[PDB]
């Protein structure tokens, strides 16, 4: 079947794996700094909540698994290496489809991917420096008068990367909408008509991006529906 | 196919969803009181165990997730709204099957559902006010001499809801057995002969209501087997 078009795929995957490996090595070397950067918002929120509680009248970052610290360090290093391998993962992926983009879409793809990457980066930066500091406090001040916030690093790391990745994508969808709309391929009528259909697929996507709880599915579908409405407004 | 019998289904689902939404709104308004009611037995058990330990010679309710308090409040509100929308849920469900119960079962269904609901509420009340206060202590005093009880609200809410719901059902099965037996449809012979087959389905049902561990599957199948024996005795 597709036997001749496999050697290039093998080489691309080999270079991708090597890139992920070197990124992992560098990230594990810098794991102290990376973990400090990840945990700074949580520490600041805990200190602020403690000050508020003391003014009204403890908190710390814990680990609930014996290998929890090592597992968290390894996971953060792996994620950073994958992120540090993004330029080379694109180097492998784009070079794979060489004849697909003959002369025109070959020129159109580069600004699109550049804009998507820069907007994902700006979304992650906005999530870390704006949304999280004013949100984590609100998440901790809610239970500050009923419970004690013993936050484990194992769950916190996953929660933090989930928020960062989602907010990065949340700033990418209304840029791919802009690219597609200004390209002229899709008009406002197409998205306005296919509104009910979106209703289900978004609700399906939330079913796959959340734990099995129905409440999580609703809490993920609502922002996605808001983003769909935002794209509806954006297309002109 | 079943196209004409779909508009009524759509209307029933829509009004049920609206009822669930209004219940969620009310429950999130009263979430402080609801969470206090849920967490009162745990606090009492912690205080009693602490007094016992001090007399022999700490404990608190914690949250292990940054959004754990908000998620717990939302989950409790959603559960309360679903419970608060149960009367209108049955309003929609019963009205759906209008012609199925022509003249006799139409009048026989109402006492059955009324009795089932009242026994479910009495079972929840019995579990909250009798079983839990004398059980939670035993679940905490068992490990009070080896470990420290830092109970997270995220798992406690699920555990308490599961116990309450199961005990409500545990007081409903030997009422549906009573209804079926007094109706005359099922005698003692039917349940006595079909004993071995039950051994399967219960173990299957207990397999679907538990985490993947085998031990908890057995620990759920045993009370169901006891309930089956109780129903066997009840048939008269």
């Amino acid at each position: 079947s597709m036997k001749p078009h496999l050697a290039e795929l093998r080489q691309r995957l080999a270079i991708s794996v090597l890139a992920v490996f070197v990124g992992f090595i560098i990230a594990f070397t810098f794991h102290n700094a990376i973990l400090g950067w990840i945990t700074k918002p949580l520490n600041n929120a805990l200190i602020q909540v403690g000050k508020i509680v003391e003014k009204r009248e403890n908190g710390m970052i814990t680990t609930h698994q014996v290998g929890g610290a090592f597992f968290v360090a390894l996971k953060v290093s792996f994620f950073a290496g994958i992120l540090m391998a993004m330029p080379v993962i694109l180097w492998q992926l784009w070079l794979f489809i060489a004849p697909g983009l003959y002369d025109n879409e070959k020129k159109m793809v580069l600004p699109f991917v550049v804009g998507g990457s820069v907007m994902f980066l700006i979304g992650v930066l906005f999530a870390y420096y704006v949304v999280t500091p004013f949100g984590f406090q609100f998440l901790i001040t809610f239970g500050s008068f009923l419970y004690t916030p013993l936050i484990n690093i194992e769950d916190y790391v996953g929660f933090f990367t989930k928020i960062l990745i989602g907010f990065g994508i949340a700033f990418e969808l209304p840029v791919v909408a802009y690219f597609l709309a200004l390209l002229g391929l899709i008009t406002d009528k197409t998205l306005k008509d296919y509104f009910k259909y979106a209703i289900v697929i978004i609700f399906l996507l939330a079913a796959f991006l959340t734990p099995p709880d129905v409440l999580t599915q609703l809490l993920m579908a609502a922002p996605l529906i808001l983003l769909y409405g935002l794209s509806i407004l954006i297309v002109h | 196919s079943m196209k004409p019998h779909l508009a009524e289904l759509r209307q029933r689902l829509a009004i049920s969803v609206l009822a669930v939404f209004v219940g969620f709104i009310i429950a999130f308004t009263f979430h402080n009181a609801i969470l206090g009611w849920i967490t009162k037995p745990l606090n009492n058990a912690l205080i009693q165990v602490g007094k016992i330990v001090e007399k022999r010679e700490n404990g608190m309710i914690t949250t292990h997730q940054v959004g754990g308090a908000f998620f717990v409040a939302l989950k409790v509100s959603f559960f309360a709204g679903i419970l608060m929308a149960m009367p209108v849920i049955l309003w929609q469900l019963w009205l759906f099957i209008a012609p199925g119960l022509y003249d006799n079962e139409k009048k026989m269904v109402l006492p059955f559902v009324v009795g089932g609901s009242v026994m479910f509420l009495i079972g929840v009340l019995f579990a909250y006010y009798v079983v839990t206060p004398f059980g939670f202590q035993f679940l905490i005093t068992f490990g009070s001499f080896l470990y420290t009880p830092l109970i997270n609200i995220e798992d406690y809410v699920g555990f308490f809801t599961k116990i309450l719901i199961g005990f409500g059902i545990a007081f409903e099965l030997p009422v549906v057995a009573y209804f079926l037996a007094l109706l005359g449809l099922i005698t003692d012979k039917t349940l006595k002969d079909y004993f071995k087959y039950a051994i399967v389905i219960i173990f299957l049902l207990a397999a679907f209501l538990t985490p993947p561990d085998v031990l908890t599957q057995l620990l759920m199948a045993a009370p169901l087997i006891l309930l089956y024996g109780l129903s066997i005795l009840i048939v008269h």
């Binding site: 609700f203 399906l204 | 689902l13």
Partner: peptide, 16 residues
């Protein structure tokens, strides 16, 4: 998924 596809079915019935 898991028990959430029920809600997907529900949204199809609610939105045709």
């Amino acid at each position: 998924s898991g028990w959430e596809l029920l809600l997907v079915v529900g949204v199809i019935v609610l939105l045709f």
